[PDB]
Structure formats: C-alpha cells, structure tokens
Design a protein around this ligand. Structure first.
Ligand SMILES: COC(=O)[C@@H](N)Cc1ccc(F)cc1
Ligand SMILES: COC(=O)[C@@H](N)Cc1ccc(F)cc1
Length: 330
C-alpha cells in the first residue's frame, strides 16, 4: 500500500504545515501537524476542556462506530516551546492520503496549553519520530508510520514541504519526479528516539564550505533551523545590522536586508536554503525589525533541522531495520 497527502502552510510565514487526516467511521477529517520530532497522534476532541477550544475541529469518539476506549491509558506530552497537552486514548481507524491503519491509538486531549488553544488552524499532531518516544501509559503505543510500515510497498515516508506553498507527505514510495539529481542517504541514530543525523558542514552565501560535523534532528514540527552559536553568528555576520536580541529571543535583522543563502552538507552533497526562506517577517506588526529563520540551539541541547532546512529538500525518512535519512535538492 501507499498514501499521499498534501500538506499546507497554516499562514503566510510557513509557521507550520497541516495535513488532512481521516479518523473514525464515518470519517472525521482533522488537520494535523505532522511532527517527525515527536511520537504521539493527539487531537482536539469532544473531551477537551471547552474553554481551551477556540475554532479547532474536534474528534468525537462517540460518533465513530470503530472507536474503542483504550482502557486505563493516559498520555501527557511537553514540547520544546514549553507547550503541552494530555488526555486519554481511543483506538480507531486512521487514514492519511488513502493509506489506512486500523487500531491506531488516537490520543484525545482533555487539556491543551494556551499556544494550542490560540492556534485555530492546528487540530492536533501526528507524530512520526520513533515509537520509543510515545507517551501513552501504562502501555506505550505505536506511531501511524510504525503501524502502517509492514503494509507499505517500501518502509519509508517522504516530506516535501513547500516554501510559501503546499507540499506533500508520501508513505510507502519515493516519487522520483519530485526532486532533482540524486538522493544522498546518511546514517541515523535511533538511540534517543528521533531522526538524529550528522551534517557534514555548512556555507554562508557564496562563501567557502566549512567541513564540520553537526549532529541534529530532522524535525518537521519545528519552524526554524537551530544550529550551534558559532555557525549562527557566522551567518548573521553577513547581514548588515543583524544582531541577537535578548528581549526578542533571537537574531533579528533589518527588514530592508537581502539575506544570503545557507548551505548544509549531507555527506558530499549540499542542500542550499535560499535567503528568502530565512525571513520570518516583522517581530510585531509594522516593525522594521524582522525575525531570523536561523537561530542558536545553545539553549536547547540539540541542533534542529526544522522546516527552514527541510523545505529546501526532498527528504526520505527510511524506516528500514536500520533507518537512514535521504536528502535531495528539488
Ligand atoms: C510553536 O507553536 C506551533 O508550532 C504552532 N502554534 C504553530 C505556529 C508556530 C509558530 C507561530 F508563529 C505560529 C504558529
Ligand atoms: C520543539 O518541538 C516542536 O516544536 C515540535 N517538534 C512539536 C510541536 C508542534 C506543534 C506545536 F503546536 C507545538 C509543538
């Protein structure tokens, strides 16, 4: 089997991407944020505290003839920005782009933090990291990909995120028309439960490539590219007037600037992020200070190849017995 679904930016900055997901019988379609940096499929629901729902579409398990309470199971998750959600668990039929999993754990939110409530475009998350990170207790549950894997034509999914435009998540096949050149594959560490890999270096604009190992994760749920402070300083030094602002929370730059590209290495291959992908617009409405799309990871504890990086590539998440990642230009 295979599946193929379009993923759409939630706003004009590509803050995040939503993909329609069919849950239950008859189908209830929710727009979920496919997250390769987490392993829970959770949704706004008829159980979510009413004051914490503001425009999201909800899953109502009582209206699904295939929903079953997973007795005794609860979940609770906290993310990198400090947001969080928690609740109980149903199993139900879940389909993405024509690919159907029966008995998928659908984690129903009883509580969500304010950043979730305040975003009306995200109806929940669909985790695509390794199932070892799933938070369901006392019986950990498998991700949608883990459940689908054995049925797929090939045990892979691909992320093809658009710049200010829709893109595609495919399951079970590699669309050879969706990229240019060849796909370069690179080793993955599954020890921490993420798609963790090592970039071979970087370049700023037309500058020389610096060969240096940068360990990080391929995170479709993260908006920005978070890299070591040395790398980030080298990038922003090429933008006149750019500076790190403690009050704003990162590097800002004059909105009048033209940004240089940023290249990252994948083995001997190179992925080029155009400068425009690094512009996240005014820090507040009407400001002439703009927020940068490359930021320091120093306060995180790991480097994160988020959407800024991934949208410059066609990315293969190869879930074979020994997982690997593939990157191609496009
Ligand atoms: C960090 O929160 C999220 O990822 C979601 N609320 C999506 C989102 C990300 C950034 C932003 F400026 C607006 C929305
Ligand atoms: C740092 O982790 C992240 O931000 C994503 N991997 C998870 C995440 C996705 C959407 C959202 F609204 C909040 C958090």
């Amino acid at each position: 089997s295979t599946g193929s679904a379009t993923t759409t930016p939630i706003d004009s900055l590509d803050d995040a991407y939503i993909t329609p997901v069919q849950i239950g019988t008859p189908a209830q379609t929710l727009n979920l944020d496919f997250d390769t940096g987490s392993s829970d499929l959770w949704v706004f629901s008829s159980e979510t505290t009413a004051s914490e729902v503001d425009g999201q579409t909800i899953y109502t398990p009582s209206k699904s003839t295939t929903a079953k309470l997973l007795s005794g199971a609860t979940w609770s998750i906290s993310y990198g920005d400090g947001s969080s959600s928690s609740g109980d668990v149903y199993t139900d039929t879940v389909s993405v782009g024509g690919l159907t999993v029966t008995g998928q754990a659908v984690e129903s939110a009883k509580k969500v933090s304010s950043s979730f409530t305040e975003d009306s475009t995200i109806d929940g998350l669909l985790g695509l990291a390794f199932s070892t990170l799933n938070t369901v207790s006392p019986t950990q549950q498998k991700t949608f990909f883990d459940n689908a894997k054995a049925s797929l034509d090939s045990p892979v999914f691909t992320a093809d995120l658009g710049y200010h435009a829709p893109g595609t998540y495919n399951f079970g096949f590699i669309d050879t028309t969706a990229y240019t050149g060849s796909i370069t594959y690179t080793a993955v560490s599954t020890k921490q439960g993420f798609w963790e890999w090592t970039s071979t270096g970087y370049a700023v604009g037309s500058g020389t490539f610096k060969s240096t190992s940068i360990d990080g994760i391929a995170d479709t749920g993260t908006t920005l590219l978070y890299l070591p402070a040395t790398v980030v300083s080298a990038y922003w030094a090429q933008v006149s007037g750019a500076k790190s602002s403690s009050s704003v929370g990162g590097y800002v730059f004059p909105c009048s600037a033209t940004l240089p590209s940023f290249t990252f290495g994948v083995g001997s291959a190179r992925i080029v992020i155009p400068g425009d992908y690094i512009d996240f617009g005014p820090i507040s409405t009407g400001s002439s200070s703009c927020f940068g799309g490359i930021q320091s990871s120093a306060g995180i504890g790991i480097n994160i190849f988020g959407d800024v990086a991934l949208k410059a590539a066609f990315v293969v998440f190869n879930g074979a017995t020994t997982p690997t990642l593939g990157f191609a230009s496009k």
